[PDB]
């Protein structure tokens, strides 16, 4: 059947370069125009650039244009796309797409999986972690830290009834937050201790914080 | 630069239309695509009103003015997904923000909004976040809206996308990061959750 299949992505630094290459199957590359396409997380899609089938031609996005260049080899089945300058807005999944019109209808037939692309200036850093005092929730801030992943457990882990951590936010610093809450009885503001339990391991870092009543 | 309704919900077998404007469309070839969550997108509509091959004949779009629609009769669940027209010129193609379909599958549920303010902790290290956690909505589309006594901020928002829970009601968070003297020069902050037109609100004061 036709498959397109995207490779290249990763975590990289605002001011260097990357290059994605996509590889196809299933039909004759060198007959249609292809494209990129982006989807910034959590939201819509924007696209990034086409090449014509024999390589003649590239158009390319207004937020991109002179940064990226598309470029296609067609006794390899393989499209590529160098990306220079990037910028943390650049952060993405990117997918290559075809074009079912020859003469390029400027719309997108087959779509790859996509691959993700992180662009962060940060260094590891680890979190600061602050309690977020209160049936009643409570919870913590994890906030500040680069790369993924954190970890965060309640009383080493003895606490799991009620436990909801968020998916974690870049940022535009480039480092990320999340937040973990828990939603315990008012009865037990008296008879318990809460302590969020947090591990990011690229940092090496462990912090336990004590959520009391303010 | 094309307009689409951030949501729309319907019933199982009612019919759902998705509008997509602008006023260069009398003169562009709209196309419509269909994306599942974590999957790639599908085309589902080629040239303002053409049903590819593979798609269900319940899909169908027509063109008024500056208006293209969607339209699915018969809605089924398998098609609530994210919808995306797309049209452009010579040199570009531009694609509509995306509506959310939910086809209904339980009833609605309003938000539950916890806020909490800086802690003590954050304030000391002259840092101040306020963290806003909406849970257990249904149909999974909010607006989330922070004020500072009765005016709107927009800088140093990040919020969440809503993610489904076990009970499949879902949740979302939203966190608005200020200098401590902007926290200390109002007398309250509120985060206004807005969920099939009805408001949730909850303050806090420094």
């Known amino acids: 059947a036709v498959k397109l299949v995207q490779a290249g992505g990763g975590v990289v630094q605002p001011g260097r370069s990357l290059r994605l290459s996509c590889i196809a199957s299933?039909?004759?590359?060198?007959?249609?125009?292809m494209h990129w396409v982006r989807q910034a997380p959590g939201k819509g899609l924007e696209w990034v650039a086409v090449?014509?089938?024999?390589?003649?031609?590239?158009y390319y996005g207004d937020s991109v244009k002179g940064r990226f260049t598309i470029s296609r080899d067609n006794s390899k089945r393989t499209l590529y796309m160098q990306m220079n300058s990037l910028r943390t807005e650049d952060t993405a999944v990117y997918y290559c797409?075809?074009?079912?019109?020859?003469?390029?209808?400027?719309?997108?037939?087959?779509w790859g999986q996509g691959v993700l692309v992180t662009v962060s200036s940060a260094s590891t850093k680890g979190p600061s972690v602050f309690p977020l005092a209160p049936t009643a929730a409570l919870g913590c801030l994890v906030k500040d830290y680069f790369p993924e992943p954190v970890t965060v457990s309640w009383n080493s882990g003895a606490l799991t009834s009620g436990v909801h951590t968020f998916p974690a936010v870049l940022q535009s610093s480039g480092l990320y937050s999340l937040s973990s809450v828990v939603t315990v009885p008012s009865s037990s503001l008296g008879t318990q201790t809460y302590i969020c339990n947090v591990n990011h391991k690229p940092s090496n870092t462990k912090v336990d914080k004590k959520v009391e009543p303010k | 630069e094309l307009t689409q309704p951030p949501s729309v919900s319907v019933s199982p077998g009612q019919t759902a239309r998705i509008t997509c404007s602008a006023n260069?469309?009398?003169?562009?070839?709209a196309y419509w695509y269909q994306q599942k969550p974590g999957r790639a997108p599908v085309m589902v509509i080629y040239?303002?009103?053409q049903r590819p091959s593979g798609i269900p004949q319940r899909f169908s779009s027509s063109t008024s003015g500056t208006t293209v629609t969607l339209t699915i009769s018969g809605v089924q669940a398998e098609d609530e997904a994210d919808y995306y027209c797309?049209?452009?010129?010579?040199?570009?193609?531009?694609f509509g923000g995306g509506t959310k379909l939910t086809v209904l599958g339980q009833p609605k549920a309003a938000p539950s909004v916890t806020l909490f303010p800086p802690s003590s902790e954050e304030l000391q290290a002259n840092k101040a976040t306020l963290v806003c956690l909406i849970s257990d909505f249904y149909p999974g589309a909010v607006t989330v809206a922070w004020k500072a006594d009765s005016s709107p901020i927009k800088a140093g928002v990040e919020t969440t996308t809503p993610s489904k829970q076990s009970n499949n009601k879902y949740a979302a968070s939203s966190y608005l990061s200020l200098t401590p003297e902007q926290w200390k020069s109002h007398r309250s902050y509120s985060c206004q959750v807005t969920h099939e037109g009805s408001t949730v609100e909850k303050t806090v004061a420094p």
């Open positions: 797309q049209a452009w010129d010579n040199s570009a193609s531009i």
């Open positions: 040239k303002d009103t």
């Open positions: 260069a469309l009398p003169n562009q070839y």
């Open positions: 299933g039909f004759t590359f060198s007959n249609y125009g």
């Open positions: 090449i014509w089938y024999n390589g003649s031609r590239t």
């Open positions: 797409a075809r074009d079912p019109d020859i003469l390029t209808a400027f719309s997108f037939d087959y």
